[PDB]
Design a protein around this nucleic acid. Structure first.
Ligand code: ZN
Lengths: 44, 123, 56, 112
RNA sequence: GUAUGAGUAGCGAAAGACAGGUGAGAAUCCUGUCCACCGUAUGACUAAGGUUUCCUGGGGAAGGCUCGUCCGCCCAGGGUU
RNA sequence: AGUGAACCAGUACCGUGAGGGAAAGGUGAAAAGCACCCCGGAAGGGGAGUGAAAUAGAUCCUGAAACCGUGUGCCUACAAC
RNA sequence: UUAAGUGAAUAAGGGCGCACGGUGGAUGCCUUGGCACUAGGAGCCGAUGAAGGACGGGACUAACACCGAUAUGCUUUGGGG
């Protein structure tokens, strides 16, 4: 029947976005951790 | 006999093959279809030897309906529908030859399936 | 079920002995002396029974 | 003085086990009838080993050897080449590998 | 990395045949004819979603559950007012 | 082995997301990297050449084992290993 | 010639040894990177817009570097030939 990963464009940028991760005190921990590891795509 | 498919598919395949080999006098196919088609063709040429109505209206069910054969013009476009050929050209060409008018020639297998092919002729 | 052992090196052959490929029925054609298959049209000569067939 | 030119072809795209049957028919015979024997074999491995044998002939004739009418196939074998590797989606999630193999074939043509 | 099982199981529902092309090579490409299948859909338009797969000209090393001159594949050019 | 990473690596790839994370160095002193002929559609190969050495020819120093083959000196079709 | 008795040799294929190749990359030698420290400098950057990035810049431009509409670079002061 119906499987999970039904993809959209708005939702994937209003959940895992950037501004939605520069709008907290925890999102910044996430970002800085992704920058320490030396990652390319900090956040989708 | 030799089945190849369901019933009606075989019937259509034979009603196909013996309608060529009426128009070209020659055909290159496999070995089994060859044997069944020599039987059928020879059985559908004796009807070319009566030439009346009943033989016409009995032959007119084992031949692809309309398949032109036009190499003729005087000042016109004469069309021969591959049955009219059966009753105009092949018929009067076999009056003295009795049964058995086809030759089968075993040539060579094929590239992709090794199905030993064969020819069919008329004289 | 499912094998209870690997087959030795010997048994492999001793079973494959009957896995061959034989060619049979090779004749000398009559117009070019080349090998042809009996009861079959000559491919290079084109002839059969001393007569030409493949022509148009 | 040397006889018996050689020839070969590397990494042909077929099994080394199935194409080791065709060869069984050739080892030992004269060159003239060998071509015939190959001509009437309906295996993909047949339409190949000709080109090797024809090439060995043309090598021996063009370079050193002569009298194509006294040549004998004396040695011929089939080795295993490098094998590609690929997968295939099995049922119930998993997958199972697949080897696509290749072979090296040589043929040698002595005089007598 | 390579064996055994083994040249075994499988090749993922549905109808093709002939003639002539093309070409080193043809059941599997092109053309023609007859046949046949769906038709509240196997037909037409759109919203998501995919992101150049579209078109023109070349190629056949790898993908294509076989073949392949062919392709939603490879190479080059170009298209979205 | 030594950082996960001696090479275009926190990359390829996996997961919606936080997150998880590889394999991959060596021709010769110098490319002098095989003009020319021949079979072959091509790939591949045989001479001739470059080279001290081509079994150093781009999968490119040495090149073991499992595994796959060719030839041959000795034995084997009343035998329970 | 009869009779009785004895009875060798050949391999569809296989075993053992030897000899020669094929796949695969252990081992020998080697370093273009690492690891742990010593002595010394240095211990902040930011509303004059930071760290980190996106897009662009070449005859050819797919990537990496450097650069920024003055874009593979401008001015000046010393080195160098
Ligand atoms: Zn002939």
């Amino acid at each position: 029947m119906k499987r999970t990963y039904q993809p959209n464009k708005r939702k994937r940028q209003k959940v895992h976005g950037f501004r939605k991760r520069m709008s907290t005190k925890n999102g910044r921990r996430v970002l800085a951790s992704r920058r320490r590891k030396g990652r390319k795509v900090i956040s989708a | 006999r030799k089945l190849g498919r369901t019933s009606s598919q075989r019937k259509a395949m034979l009603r196909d093959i013996t309608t060529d080999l009426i128009i070209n006098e020659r055909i290159v196919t496999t070995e089994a279809r060859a044997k069944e088609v020599r039987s059928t063709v020879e059985k559908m040429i004796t009807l070319g030897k009566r030439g009346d109505l009943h033989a016409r209206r009995q032959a007119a069910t084992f031949v692809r309906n309309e398949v032109a054969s036009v190499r003729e013009e005087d000042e016109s476009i004469v069309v021969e529908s591959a049955l009219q050929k059966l009753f105009n050209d092949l018929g009067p060409r076999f009056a003295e030859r009795q049964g058995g008018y086809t030759r089968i020639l075993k040539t060579e297998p094929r590239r992709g399936d090794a199905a030993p092919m064969v020819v069919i002729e008329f004289v | 079920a499912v094998p209870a052992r690997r087959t030795s090196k010997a048994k492999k052959a001793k079973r494959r002995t009957h896995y061959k490929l034989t060619i049979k029925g090779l004749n000398a054609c009559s117009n070019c002396g080349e090998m042809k298959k009996s009861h079959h049209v000559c491919p290079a000569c084109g002839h059969y029974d001393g007569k030409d067939v493949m022509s148009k | 003085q040397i006889t018996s030119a050689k020839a070969t072809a590397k990494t042909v795209r077929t099994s080394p086990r199935k194409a080791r049957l065709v060869i069984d028919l050739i080892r030992g015979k004269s060159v003239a009838d060998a071509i015939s024997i190959l001509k009437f074999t309906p295996n993909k491995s047949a339409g190949i080993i000709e080109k090797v044998l024809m090439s060995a002939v043309a090598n021996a004739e063009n370079n050193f050897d002569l009298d194509v009418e006294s040549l004998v196939v004396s040695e011929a074998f089939v080795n295993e080449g490098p094998t590609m590797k690929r997968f295939r989606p099995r049922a119930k999630g998993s997958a199972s590998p697949i080897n696509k193999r290749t072979s090296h074939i040589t043929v040698v043509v002595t005089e007598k």
